[PDB]
Design a protein around this ligand. Sequence first.
Ligand SMILES: [Mn+2]
Ligand SMILES: [Mn+2]
Length: 176
Amino acid sequence: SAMEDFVRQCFNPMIVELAEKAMKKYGEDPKIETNKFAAICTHLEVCFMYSDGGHRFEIIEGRDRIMAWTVVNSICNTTGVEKPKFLPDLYDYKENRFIEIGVTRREVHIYYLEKANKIKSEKTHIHIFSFTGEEMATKADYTLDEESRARIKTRLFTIRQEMASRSLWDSFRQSE
Ligand SMILES: [Mn+2]
Ligand SMILES: [Mn+2]
């Protein structure tokens, strides 16, 4: 498949290996769920760029569940922040809050409403990125500076356009 080829060419080997183990754990093959493969890789990469945009951020995403819940619990015991019911993506030590990162092929406000209805904790901050340079965040507080968010949005647009040059974007956007 071309989608798997694109994933292995454009994403860093570490991100690809993380996405593959995350899928293989639940019985999913990246050679069939190729759009899900690309989506996991893209989300992981966004989380890592977000965390490097500051150290200000703790990466929860990408860790095995044991190590991730260990990190979340250590944060909760040293800070007193309430424990999330779902594993979030990052922790902001400056704002002292968990962040849930979303990357959507659809409208930012659709996905934002979906995520907010999912987590149901006003504590966890929501930040949604689109592939069109659009973004939506809790209380319109975008946490990061304009340069870091422009970095993320450029990378997302580039993934979309490299998918389009391979005639893969149409499959990808109708797959969420
Ligand atoms: Mn996550
Ligand atoms: Mn997420």
